[PDB]
Each structure stands twice: as structure tokens, then as C-alpha cells.
Ligand binder design. Structure first.
Ligand SMILES: CN[C@@H]1[C@@H](O)[C@@H](O[C@@H]2[C@@H](O)[C@H](O[C@H]3O[C@H]([C@@H](C)O)[C@@H](O)[C@H](O)[C@H]3N)[C@@H](N)C[C@H]2N)OC[C@]1(C)O
Ligand SMILES: CN[C@@H]1[C@@H](O)[C@@H](O[C@@H]2[C@@H](O)[C@H](O[C@H]3O[C@H]([C@@H](C)O)[C@@H](O)[C@H](O)[C@H]3N)[C@@H](N)C[C@H]2N)OC[C@]1(C)O
Ligand SMILES: [Mg+2]
Ligand SMILES: [Mg+2]
Ligand SMILES: [Mg+2]
Ligand SMILES: [Mg+2]
Ligand SMILES: [Mg+2]
Ligand SMILES: [Mg+2]
Ligand SMILES: [Mg+2]
Ligand SMILES: [Mg+2]
Ligand SMILES: [Mg+2]
Ligand SMILES: [Mg+2]
Ligand SMILES: [Mg+2]
Ligand SMILES: [Mg+2]
Ligand SMILES: [Mg+2]
Ligand SMILES: [Mg+2]
Ligand SMILES: [Mg+2]
Ligand SMILES: [Mg+2]
Ligand SMILES: [Mg+2]
Ligand SMILES: [Mg+2]
Ligand SMILES: [Mg+2]
Ligand SMILES: [Mg+2]
Ligand SMILES: [Mg+2]
Ligand SMILES: [Mg+2]
Ligand SMILES: [Mg+2]
Ligand SMILES: [Mg+2]
Ligand SMILES: [Mg+2]
Ligand SMILES: [Mg+2]
Ligand SMILES: [Mg+2]
Ligand SMILES: [Mg+2]
Ligand SMILES: [Mg+2]
Ligand SMILES: [Mg+2]
Ligand SMILES: [Mg+2]
Ligand SMILES: [Mg+2]
Ligand SMILES: [Mg+2]
Ligand SMILES: [Mg+2]
Ligand SMILES: [Mg+2]
Ligand SMILES: [Mg+2]
Ligand SMILES: [Mg+2]
Ligand SMILES: [Mg+2]
Ligand SMILES: [Mg+2]
Ligand SMILES: [Mg+2]
Ligand SMILES: [Mg+2]
Ligand SMILES: [Mg+2]
Ligand SMILES: [Mg+2]
Ligand SMILES: [Mg+2]
Ligand SMILES: [Mg+2]
Ligand SMILES: [Mg+2]
Ligand SMILES: [Mg+2]
Ligand SMILES: [Mg+2]
Ligand SMILES: [Mg+2]
Ligand SMILES: [Mg+2]
Ligand SMILES: [Mg+2]
Ligand SMILES: [Mg+2]
Ligand SMILES: [Mg+2]
Ligand SMILES: [Mg+2]
Ligand SMILES: [Mg+2]
Ligand SMILES: [Mg+2]
Ligand SMILES: [Mg+2]
Ligand SMILES: [Mg+2]
Ligand SMILES: [Mg+2]
Ligand SMILES: [Mg+2]
Ligand SMILES: [Mg+2]
Ligand SMILES: [Mg+2]
Ligand SMILES: [Mg+2]
Ligand SMILES: [Mg+2]
Lengths: 111, 127, 106, 156, 197, 48
RNA sequence: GAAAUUGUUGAAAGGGAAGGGCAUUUGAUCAGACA
RNA sequence: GGAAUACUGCCAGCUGGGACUGAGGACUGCGACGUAAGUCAAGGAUGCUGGCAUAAUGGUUAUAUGCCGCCCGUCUUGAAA
RNA sequence: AGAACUGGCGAUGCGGGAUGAACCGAACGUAGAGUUAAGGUGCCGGAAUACACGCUCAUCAGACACCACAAAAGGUGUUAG
RNA sequence: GCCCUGAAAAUGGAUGGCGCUCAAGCGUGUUACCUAUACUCUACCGUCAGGGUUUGAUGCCCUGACGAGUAGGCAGGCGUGGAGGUCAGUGACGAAGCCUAGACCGUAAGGUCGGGUCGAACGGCCUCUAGUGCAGAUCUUGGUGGUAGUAGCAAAUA
RNA sequence: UUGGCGGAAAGGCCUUGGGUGCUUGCUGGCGAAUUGCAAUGUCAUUUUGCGUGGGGAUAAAUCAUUUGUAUACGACUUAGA
């Protein structure tokens, strides 16, 4: 894996563009705030920026509110990965591991 | 004179010719799926012949449509040709291969009458 | 005058290919004097015709044309990818092509 | 019967289309395209010809004239994308232009009206051409790429 | 660009002049090289001889006829290195190789044609100074190419009548300059320089 | 080395002539008849 | 009156086999559609 | 002491060029601009024009050309062997 | 020759390792466009005869994991300690 | 550290090849680029599933996800001989069969057509039944090639 | 057409004299449309054939026979109005 600390900016774009819902399984695209208030209203969270909120704030419902989100499907880096070989640690010039705030510029070329 | 239909997309116009029906005369083109253990065709090595499988399947919406947009239906006499009277924009008629020369002009007539396309309207026509 | 040319001279190089696999759906063009991907951004979407000659007459001519358009820049020296109504014959690798000036944005 | 028959048949009734949402909005031409700018004709019968742009038309084309008395292009339709707009300009403020529209070119040799219309628009333009010397002769000569012209480098 | 490019062989690196000449032929540019006998190869003479006696030993065993053909001509040793850089058992490659001529010296018509040079193949820009290098026909001559001195005599013949033309040229380009000088200061002249000319 | 011309004398012996012929008895024996015409003048073609 | 296989006519291609896949040019040849 | 600029990031800032795609087919939904009546790019392409109306597109076929393709069946850990 | 855990090959194509059952990459319905992996970008060959600091001259130079080998021991070759 | 020496094998040969020497080598840094049946988006196919809906209800409709496979299992289908039923089915104005780099439907097994040859029977559908589908078994019977106008047709005096 | 130079594959270069076409060096008088807003919009050179007529030219080799400086056969070498 590569992972890190996501910015508001990228949590937004993630859920706007590629956010998708789990409703009876079935990966439903979001597109209308009312699909959120259907499932996630039980916890509050009637809006999509309500959804982002719970996620970046790690609010009390974070389990449900994160679990609701289909695992995002991201493309390959549009600017390519940087580095020649992926499977060393970011520290050593590879790409895996905890790249900390650098998780941003990556996930954005993959979105 | 057909129903409207989407662009008819085929996915394979090439026929599937069974591996080696070009090699031995005894091997008939008629498609057959190799069960052999070393067969580069079964294992799908690059550069070998393609194999029939469900993804090549024509679209449901354009399936069975001849180029003219009509599903073709086999007709041995007027009574069969008359089952198509209300479907003139759906089916076309094909006259069967054995129908007598004299009985064709009969059908050809009744069909021009009903506006029912006939696909093979030449066979056995004295000219 | 002497010169009547309304297009830039260009050559048909390869298909798009990896080492062992080509793709006739896409061809690789060298355009006279275009040295950089920057330069080649000028020519995208501009329309290519490959002109060849025949023995049979057809629509009144013994000349024929395959039409195409630059799709994208290809690599660092100004090669450019094009795609043709019917793909190029690959006898034509090293053949002349015509990149017309239109659609113009000038 | 030699073929059985379907239990079901599709409906020969044709449905209407869902009501499409696409609006016809004005096409804005590029900043190079302003009346009285000289045009290089890239294609078509008059390809290579240098021409004067007159009016942006209703059907998105470009009204231009040669002017006819000079290079032989009459008042004619022309397409934006098929033309290089040069930087050199002449004042069209003396040229009527408004007679001309889509129907003026409806298809239905040369009628008396267009003959006269041309001589009109041309006098107005030949005037402003004489103002600036060599420009009559440049509007008559044809555009050709010489060995070494690199349109991606080339100012017009 | 040009319907034929005459390259001047002298003082280019075989490897790189090859690589450039190849792609041109695979790209459709007819090329003819002259003065190949003046090509250079990195490394000193003696190494490139042993390098040739190594090619020399390889031959098909049971018939020394059907085995590798060892060409001793400077033009050939170069044609070799080209051929290896083309896919020369393909139809596409027979095409390429037919666009290219190679010669010793500068024979007819080429001699009346200007010849270019390949900057990325020039030995003077490319070797670091003081690295030793070999001159082709000296190598070729040690491996049996008979014609080195016939080349020499005919190039020493050519370059004389070449100087005689370049003489006459020079003198006439002087007349040109002197009339073009009295053309300066005029109405045209300053107009022209105004626009870049 | 390359041969850029030959010059042959006027009159050729009927022994040598016999060498250019596979069947001499049947021939019209035309060999070097037109070549001999090169001598009719001062032979400036020869001398050339 | 099939196939192996064979004669003649027609066409085509062939620089140490032939055959295949993708794709187009060219030759040939054809369906459909429209009105 | 006062700035500049680099560097990193942010914008629900504005905008040019190019490529591929147009599934669906009355209406129904979420909205958006409007004082309004209306309008829209808001639950999937329409508007304008030209050419041809025929082997022109296409199918098939032989062939040439680019790249790729080793004899099948079998037993076997392993078969072009 | 023979055990332990796991991943594989066998039963499996695809991209890379020229080539190769097991390595790297990544696993397979028919297509299109985009972007990548492993590996590469003088020419064969798609892709910088790109930029950058050095080292290296071999009368057997050297050139990329698995991988198609080399050692003790020497050099007043040159380099930096 | 690189280089030299230490370093001997049998057909002619392999950094893959050409070739490369301020590299096209070695160590390291930065970009840009090339392209897998992988990743993203959309079309189509199939499979599984979750809904909706009394006129093919074994139906129609909405929605999402998935798709490698030898030995092997299950499924839905294609074709042959014969049987029960049907279409008052095709046919001497030409059945069946054969031929055909002609045309059409299917992913496919297959099905349909035109033209040729032909002569006396034969097909669709819903079911029934089995001596039901071949490339091979040094398979059985028959038939035919290449080898090939070849080996050869020379003991016994003519 | 005058004269000269060129054998590396010269087959090309250079020069003299008159005839003749163009000249955008400069200044006039006309023409250009309807190919319909694009459609390579056809302008190159390759070989070949068939006719008209303008120069020019009027042979060989093979089988068969024959020699033996030759020979398995083909081939080789000789001979014959
Ligand atoms: C129609 N029969 C075939 C015909 O297909 C064609 O074959 C070509 C063949 O010559 C091509 O050519 C090739 O094959 C020939 C052959 C004599 O082996 C080789 O000499 C040659 O090197 C090679 N390029 C090959 N690449 C494809 C075939 N279609 O040539 C005639 C033929 C061999 O009888
Ligand atoms: C895979 N191909 C191989 C080929 O590579 C070679 O096999 C080598 C063999 O030469 C090696 O063996 C030989 O050569 C090596 C050296 C070159 O490593 C020496 O160390 C060793 O003493 C010697 N016996 C052995 N170590 C591995 C095999 N794959 O020779 C045999 C072969 C089958 O052709
Ligand atoms: Mg990119
Ligand atoms: Mg990358
Ligand atoms: Mg990499
Ligand atoms: Mg098919
Ligand atoms: Mg066969
Ligand atoms: Mg067969
Ligand atoms: Mg196996
Ligand atoms: Mg692709
Ligand atoms: Mg294409
Ligand atoms: Mg004029
Ligand atoms: Mg010798
Ligand atoms: Mg037969
Ligand atoms: Mg042979
Ligand atoms: Mg082969
Ligand atoms: Mg043979
Ligand atoms: Mg092929
Ligand atoms: Mg910034
Ligand atoms: Mg639609
Ligand atoms: Mg419009
Ligand atoms: Mg047309
Ligand atoms: Mg076509
Ligand atoms: Mg084809
Ligand atoms: Mg073929
Ligand atoms: Mg291969
Ligand atoms: Mg076995
Ligand atoms: Mg074994
Ligand atoms: Mg096997
Ligand atoms: Mg073991
Ligand atoms: Mg096994
Ligand atoms: Mg397998
Ligand atoms: Mg695998
Ligand atoms: Mg591979
Ligand atoms: Mg591999
Ligand atoms: Mg795909
Ligand atoms: Mg792709
Ligand atoms: Mg090579
Ligand atoms: Mg390249
Ligand atoms: Mg460099
Ligand atoms: Mg550098
Ligand atoms: Mg290896
Ligand atoms: Mg060593
Ligand atoms: Mg080597
Ligand atoms: Mg390399
Ligand atoms: Mg380096
Ligand atoms: Mg860069
Ligand atoms: Mg269900
Ligand atoms: Mg249901
Ligand atoms: Mg499966
Ligand atoms: Mg099985
Ligand atoms: Mg039975
Ligand atoms: Mg057949
Ligand atoms: Mg019949
Ligand atoms: Mg019959
Ligand atoms: Mg009978
Ligand atoms: Mg049985
Ligand atoms: Mg059988
Ligand atoms: Mg059999
Ligand atoms: Mg079997
Ligand atoms: Mg036998
Ligand atoms: Mg026999
Ligand atoms: Mg006999
Ligand atoms: Mg005999
Ligand atoms: Mg015999
Ligand atoms: Mg005997």
C-alpha cells in the first residue's frame, strides 16, 4: 500500500467525483444529497458535505459513515508514479508505506 | 420498411475455423474446441486462432436482424406468408428452397399484396 | 507560382507498437521541422491525407486518398500520433503524408 | 408450414423521443476574426487565395469578398475553421454588408442582382485597399508554403 | 528534406554515422556516403585490427562458402555496421538498404554535389581529445582491401580540380559582394534591412 | 582495372575471323566489316 | 456419382517448406439500403 | 528595517487547443437562472450545411506489407522435442 | 537426496527477463479512449544520441536480480581516502 | 574505487544483434517519454443477485456485481436413425442427395438461400426411443498419392 | 552554334555567336463568380503495346552430320555451300 494523511481538498474531490454508496450492496453513485439522508440520516449526515465532515473530523459515527462509502476506485497516476520501482518504501525512493501528507499529490493524479 | 434499430454491430464477421482444418483435409472447418493437453490453441498462446465465447454475442437489440432490419421467416405457401401480415416492418419472408416454381409466383404475388418483404424473390424465376 | 503547397510534408513511421506487438489502428507521423512536443501541439486535430495512385479509374480519378487526423503528441522529438478512416497499409512506412493546415485556429 | 411461428411479436408502434435538452447558442469566433481582416483560404476552390472578411453569417459561415476585381473571388461563403486570419486589416466601415444573409445564397449562370451587388461592395473595398501600398498586389497573389515555412512558428 | 543527402564520410564515427544513416533509410531518406575510406573508429588501430581478425575467423565449417562473408572494403565495413542496424531480412528493410549508396573517394556525379556532415557522428565533437582512434582504409588495407592507393591518387586528382572551381567561385562571390555593396545605402537596401534582410 | 576501349587493325585474318564464328561455313562472314569502314577516311574515329 | 487423388482450361503467388492470427492497400466479387 | 521572490499547498478563479464516447427514447426526479412570464449545459446529442445515392461505405475473397504464430494426439513434474 | 511456513508451476494465457514450466509485472467475457506496472528510450525497436557530478582506456575493456561463474595472490596504471 | 595480471579445450559466434570509449561502460542524481489481457470511464455479451409488475408471466421492467481453468462435476443447447401427435406441411411445374474462395441468421454446435447437377420422395413443430455425432486406437474394410517413368528388366559363351 | 574541359561509374561542366519565348524592374486596359462553406480535387515518371513516317541496318545460333586436345548423360573442342 501507499497511504497518508488526506487533505480537505482531496477528501472533497474523492467523495464528489468517485464517492459511491453501499445500499443493499449495489454500489449506488451519490449525485443527490437525498441518497445520503436515506441511509445516513439515522446518524445525522443528510448532506454530502455532512459526509465529508464525518470523515475528516472522524466524528462519532465514523464507522458507519466510512463503511457506507464504497472503496474508491482510482486510476493510475496521471503524471505517473515518480520513482522507477514501486515496491520499496517511500523513504528509500520506492512508493509504498506511509508517505504522510504526500498522500495528497498522488491520490489526486489518481483521481 | 423495417422497424428502427440501432447500428447493427457484429463483433466477429470472421468465421471460427477449427484448429487445423487448413492442415489436414480430414479436418472439417466446422468449429470444434480442442481438449488436448499441449494445444497452443486451448491455452491461448499469442498468434493463434480466436475461440468462440459468450462475449462475442451480438446485442439483444440488433440480434437476428438481417442487414435490411427484418428478422427473416421461412414460408412454404401463402398461409405461412400470411402469418406475417401485421409484422411487415418486423419480419421479411424467405421462400423455402423446395417450393415449386409455379407456387413461388403465387406467393410473390400475395406478398407484394400484403407489403411483406421477400428475401429470395428471384429463385426459380423464368427470365 | 512554383510552390502550390497548402500542407506540411510528413512521413509515416510505424504503427503504434510495443516491442513485439503492433497496433494498425494508430500510426506514428514525423512532421517536417516539428522538433518538440510543444511544437506538435500546434498540429493536433489537423487533418492528414495520404495520397496514392492506382491503375483503375474510380470516381473519375487514378489518384486516391486516405484521410486522418493528428491525435496526440508522441514522445520527445515531435513525433505525433494520427488515426485514419481506414488504417494505413504499412507498405507505407517511410511514405509521404500530407498534414493540411485545417481545422485552423489561427 | 416449413417454419413454426413466434408465440410473440414485437410492437410495430414507434415511440417518440425523450425530450432532448440541447440549446442552440451563438458560436463565438476567435479573436482573430474581425471584419476587414485579410483571410488566407486554406481549402476549397479558392484555396491559397487571399481574401477580405466582411460579415459573420447566421449559418456560422463567414461572408468574404476577394475583392473580385482583384483576385477573382466573388462575394462568397467560407468556413471559419478552413481559413487562416491574417493580421493585416482594411477598414470595412465604408461597406454596406447588411443585404447579405443565408437566403441571399439559397441554391434553387449568374443573376443580374449578384453581379451588381459585387461591383458595389468592391468599390468600397478597393478604396481602402488603395490607401495602403502593395496591398492590391498582395491580395491578388496566392499563398504557398515555401520549403522552410513552419506554420507552428509562423506569424501571419 | 532533400531527395538525396550526400554525406561526407571523412572523420565520422562508424557506429554513430551508421545509426544515423540507418534510421534515415528506414524513414525514407535516400543517403549516399562518400570518402568512407576516411571514416574513423574509436580505439586505436591495433585493437580494431584484432577486432577484424575476430570477425575474420568466423566461417561456416563444412563450406567456408556459405559462411559469414568478410568484406575488406572500407565502404563495406561500413555497409556492414549499417546492415546490422536494419531489419534486413524484411521486405521493409530491403527497401531501406536500397536507398543508400556508399563509396570510396567521391566518384562521379556526387563529386559535383555538395556533401553534408553528421554532427553527432563527428569524431572531433565526439571523442574526447587524446583518445586514440583508427582510420578505416588503413584498417581495411591491412585486411586486404587492394584499392587504397587508387583512391589516394584519384582523390589527389579530384581535390586539385576542386580547388580550381573554389578559386573561380571565390573570385566571383567577390564580384557579387562588390555589386551588393554598391547596392547598400540605397532605397531598397535600408527598406530590406528594416525587415530582417 | 577496367578496359575502356579496343582498337583493331583494318584487315583481319580469316583464321581470327573463324574464331568469332561457331559455324563458319554457313556464315555470311560479316565480322569486322563495318569496323573496317572506320579506315575509309583519315581514320579520325580510330585515332580518337 | 462425394473425398483422397489426377488432366486441361482460367486466375494468382512464389530469393533454403507450406500453412495461421491482427490490420490495411490492391484485384476480384457480392448483399443491403435508398427511392 | 521594509519589501520582493523561490518553494509547498488551496480556490465551490477565469479560459484556449486535441482525442474518444452520444448508451437511452412521451411525461414523471434533484435543481438552476429569473420581479416576473419564462429559460437552462438540470435523471445519456442535437442544430446547421455538403457530397453520394452507388460497389462510394461495407461484406467476402485472393495477395502484398508490418508485427506476431513450432504439430497435433498422448503419458508426464516437465513435449516443438 | 530429504523435511518446515508460504507463495507458485502443474491446471494459465497476457506484459517484462532476446530465448526459457516456476523470476519480475499482472492474472484472461467482446470493444473503445485514457493511465500505468515489470522493463525500457543510439539503430535494429515504440521511447530524451536528455540534463548532471565523477570514475574507467584494457595487444583478451565493460555493460544490469533469478542467469547462464570465477579465487587466493600481485601492479611505481589512475582515482579518492 | 575502476583498470591490468593471475584466467587452458576442442564446428565458426555471440553484452540478444549491430556498434559504442568526456559511451551507447561503471557509480549516482533529476526530469521527460514508450507500452500489458492490469488500473479508470463508457458501449455490448454472459452469469449471479436484489427490487418492480395481472398481455411471450416459462414473461416484461429496474438496479449492482462478477467473468482464468487440466482432471472433473452440473447446465442450456446443436445434430442423426426410428416412433406417437400436429401443420388437410414440400414435391415429377422436380423430393433426397451431391457441387458452389455466391447471399443471410447464431458466440457456437448448426440453420437458411440462390445458382449447378439430379431424379422420387421429404420437412417444421410438441413429444417418444436409441446400434445417435470421430482426426487419431501400430484401429476394420475399401479407395488413392509422393517415392517414380525411379530400383530395376546384367547367371546359364551368340 | 563557336570553342574548350572532364574515364572513378567520364555521359557532365565551362564558353562564343546570332534567333526566339517569359520577365513581378515600373505604369495601364480586361477576365476570374454557379467547383455552390471542405472533399489530392487529378499538373509527376515507369515500362509496354498499336498504328501513321522520319533517319539507319540487312545476322546468327541451335538440331543433324562431324573431330577427340572432350566426355557418365548434358557439357567441352573441332570440321562442312
Ligand atoms: C499460393 N501458394 C504459395 C503462395 O502463398 C506464395 O507463398 C508466399 C511465399 O512465397 C512468401 O514468401 C516467402 O516464402 C518463399 C517460399 C518459396 O518459401 C521464400 O522463398 C521467401 O524467402 C519468403 N519471403 C511467404 N512469406 C508467404 C506465402 N504466401 O507463393 C507461392 C506458393 C509458395 O506456392
Ligand atoms: C541452460 N543451458 C546450458 C548452458 O548454460 C550450460 O550449462 C551451464 C554450465 O555451463 C555450468 O557449468 C560449467 O560452467 C560453469 C560456469 C559457466 O558457471 C563452471 O563454473 C562449471 O565448473 C562448469 N561445469 C553450470 N554451472 C550451469 C549450467 N546451466 O551448458 C549446458 C546447457 C544445457 O547448454
Ligand atoms: Mg503521458
Ligand atoms: Mg513512470
Ligand atoms: Mg520503471
Ligand atoms: Mg460469422
Ligand atoms: Mg486443406
Ligand atoms: Mg480441410
Ligand atoms: Mg501441459
Ligand atoms: Mg491501444
Ligand atoms: Mg483508426
Ligand atoms: Mg490578375
Ligand atoms: Mg583474397
Ligand atoms: Mg476432387
Ligand atoms: Mg533453390
Ligand atoms: Mg515456416
Ligand atoms: Mg523441394
Ligand atoms: Mg500473412
Ligand atoms: Mg504555485
Ligand atoms: Mg440515442
Ligand atoms: Mg448553426
Ligand atoms: Mg465519393
Ligand atoms: Mg475498402
Ligand atoms: Mg483481408
Ligand atoms: Mg491467405
Ligand atoms: Mg515467430
Ligand atoms: Mg502416450
Ligand atoms: Mg519422463
Ligand atoms: Mg505435444
Ligand atoms: Mg529435490
Ligand atoms: Mg499431471
Ligand atoms: Mg495449461
Ligand atoms: Mg501465471
Ligand atoms: Mg513475453
Ligand atoms: Mg516470457
Ligand atoms: Mg479492455
Ligand atoms: Mg489500451
Ligand atoms: Mg538487429
Ligand atoms: Mg524510436
Ligand atoms: Mg550527449
Ligand atoms: Mg552527462
Ligand atoms: Mg538472459
Ligand atoms: Mg578479468
Ligand atoms: Mg560482443
Ligand atoms: Mg540500449
Ligand atoms: Mg550513467
Ligand atoms: Mg526533460
Ligand atoms: Mg431474478
Ligand atoms: Mg424479480
Ligand atoms: Mg470458467
Ligand atoms: Mg473437461
Ligand atoms: Mg437404429
Ligand atoms: Mg471448395
Ligand atoms: Mg435446383
Ligand atoms: Mg434438388
Ligand atoms: Mg425413378
Ligand atoms: Mg456408435
Ligand atoms: Mg464416420
Ligand atoms: Mg478417418
Ligand atoms: Mg480425438
Ligand atoms: Mg503404394
Ligand atoms: Mg503407382
Ligand atoms: Mg515407362
Ligand atoms: Mg526408361
Ligand atoms: Mg531405368
Ligand atoms: Mg541384377
Amino acid at each position: 500500500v501507499a497511504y497518508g494523511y488526506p487533505s480537505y481538498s482531496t477528501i472533497r474531490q474523492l467523495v464528489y467525483k468517485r464517492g459511491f454508496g453501499k445500499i443493499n450492496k449495489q454500489r449506488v453513485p451519490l449525485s443527490d444529497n437525498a441518497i445520503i439522508e436515506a441511509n445516513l440520516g439515522k446518524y445525522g449526515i443528510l448532506s454530502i458535505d455532512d459526509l465529508i465532515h464525518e470523515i475528516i473530523t472522524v466524528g462519532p459515527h465514523f464507522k458507519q459513515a466510512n463503511n457506507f462509502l464504497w472503496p474508491f476506485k482510482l486510476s493510475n497516476p496521471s503524471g505517473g508514479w515518480g520513482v522507477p520501482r514501486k515496491f520499496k518504501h517511500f523513504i528509500q525512493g520506492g512508493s509504498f508505506g506511509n508517505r504522510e501528507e504526500f498522500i495528497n499529490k498522488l491520490v489526486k493524479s489518481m483521481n | 420498411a423495417s422497424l428502427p434499430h440501432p447500428k447493427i454491430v457484429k463483433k466477429h464477421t470472421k468465421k471460427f475455423k477449427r484448429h487445423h482444418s487448413d492442415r489436414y483435409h480430414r479436418v472439417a472447418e466446422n468449429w470444434r474446441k480442442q481438449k488436448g493437453i499441449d494445444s497452443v490453441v486451448r491455452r491461448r498462446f499469442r498468434g493463434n486462432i480466436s475461440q468462440p465465447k459468450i462475449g462475442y454475442g451480438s446485442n439483444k437489440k440488433t440480434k437476428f436482424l438481417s442487414p435490411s432490419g427484418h428478422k427473416t421467416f421461412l414460408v412454404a405457401n401463402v398461409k405461412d406468408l400470411e402469418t406475417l401480415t401485421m409484422h411487415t416492418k418486423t419480419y421479411a419472408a424467405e421462400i423455402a428452397h423446395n417450393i415449386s416454381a409455379k407456387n413461388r409466383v403465387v406467393i410473390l404475388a400475395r406478398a407484394k399484396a400484403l407489403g411483406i418483404k421477400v428475401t429470395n424473390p428471384k429463385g426459380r424465376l423464368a427470365l | 507560382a512554383e510552390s502550390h503547397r497548402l500542407y506540411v510534408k510528413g512521413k509515416h513511421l510505424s504503427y503504434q507498437r510495443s516491442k513485439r506487438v503492433n497496433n494498425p489502428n494508430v500510426s506514428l507521423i514525423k512532421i517536417e521541422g516539428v522538433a518538440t512536443p510543444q511544437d506538435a501541439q500546434f498540429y493536433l486535430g489537423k487533418r492528414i491525407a495520404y495520397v496514392y495512385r492506382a491503375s483503375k479509374e474510380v470516381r473519375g480519378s487514378k489518384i486516391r486518398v486516405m484521410w486522418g487526423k493528428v491525435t496526440r503528441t508522441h514522445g520527445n522529438s515531435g513525433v505525433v500520433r494520427a488515426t485514419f478512416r481506414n488504417n494505413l497499409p504499412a507498405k507505407t512506412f517511410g511514405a509521404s503524408v500530407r498534414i493540411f493546415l485545417y481545422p485552423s485556429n489561427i | 408450414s416449413a417454419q413454426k411461428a413466434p408465440k410473440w411479436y414485437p410492437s410495430e408502434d414507434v415511440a417518440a423521443l425523450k425530450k432532448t435538452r440541447k440549446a442552440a447558442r451563438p458560436q463565438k469566433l476567435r479573436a482573430s476574426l474581425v471584419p476587414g481582416t485579410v483571410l488566407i483560404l486554406l481549402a476549397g476552390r479558392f484555396r491559397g487565395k487571399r481574401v477580405v472578411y466582411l460579415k459573420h453569417l447566421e449559418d456560422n459561415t463567414l461572408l468574404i469578398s476577394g475583392p473580385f476585381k482583384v483576385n477573382g473571388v466573388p462575394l462568397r461563403r467560407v468556413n471559419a475553421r478552413y481559413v487562416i486570419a491574417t493580421s493585416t486589416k482594411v477598414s470595412v466601415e465604408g461597406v454596406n454588408v447588411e443585404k447579405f444573409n443565408v437566403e441571399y445564397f439559397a441554391k434553387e449562370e449568374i443573376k443580374a442582382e449578384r453581379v451588381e451587388d459585387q461591383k458595389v461592395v468592391d468599390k468600397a473595398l478597393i478604396a481602402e485597399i488603395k490607401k495602403t501600398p502593395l496591398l492590391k498586389q498582395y491580395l491578388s497573389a496566392s499563398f504557398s508554403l515555401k520549403n522552410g515555412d513552419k506554420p507552428h512558428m509562423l506569424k501571419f | 528534406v532533400e531527395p538525396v543527402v550526400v554525406i561526407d564520410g571523412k572523420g565520422h564515427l562508424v557506429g554513430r554515422l551508421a545509426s544515423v544513416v540507418a534510421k534515415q533509410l528506414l524513414n525514407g531518406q535516400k543517403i549516399v556516403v562518400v570518402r568512407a575510406e576516411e571514416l574513423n573508429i574509436s580505439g586505436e588501430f591495433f585493437r580494431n585490427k584484432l577486432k577484424y581478425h575476430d570477425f575474420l575467423r568466423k566461417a561456416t565449417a563444412f563450406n567456408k562458402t556459405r559462411g559469414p562473408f568478410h568484406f575488406r572494403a572500407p565502404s563495406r565495413i561500413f555497409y556492414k555496421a549499417l546492415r546490422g542496424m536494419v531489419s534486413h531480412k524484411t521486405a521493409r528493410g530491403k527497401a531501406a538498404l536500397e536507398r543508400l549508396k556508399v563509396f570510396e573517394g567521391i566518384p562521379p556525379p556526387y563529386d559535383k554535389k555538395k556533401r553534408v556532415v553528421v554532427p553527432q557522428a563527428l569524431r572531433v565533437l565526439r571523442l574526447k581529445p587524446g583518445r586514440k582512434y583508427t582510420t578505416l582504409g588503413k584498417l581495411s588495407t591491412s585486411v586486404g582491401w587492394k584499392y587504397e592507393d587508387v583512391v589516394a591518387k584519384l582523390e589527389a586528382k579530384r581535390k586539385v580540380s576542386s580547388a580550381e572551381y573554389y578559386a573561380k567561385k571565390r573570385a566571383f562571390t567577390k564580384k557579387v559582394a562588390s555589386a551588393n555593396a554598391t547596392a547598400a545605402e540605397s532605397d531598397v537596401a535600408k527598406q530590406l534591412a528594416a525587415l530582417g534582410y | 582495372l577496367r578496359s575502356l576501349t579496343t582498337v583493331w587493325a583494318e584487315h583481319l585474318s580469316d583464321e581470327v575471323k573463324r574464331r568469332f564464328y561457331k559455324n563458319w561455313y554457313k556464315s555470311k562472314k560479316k565480322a569486322f566489316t563495318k569496323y573496317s569502314a572506320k579506315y575509309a577516311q583519315d581514320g579520325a574515329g580510330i585515332e580518337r
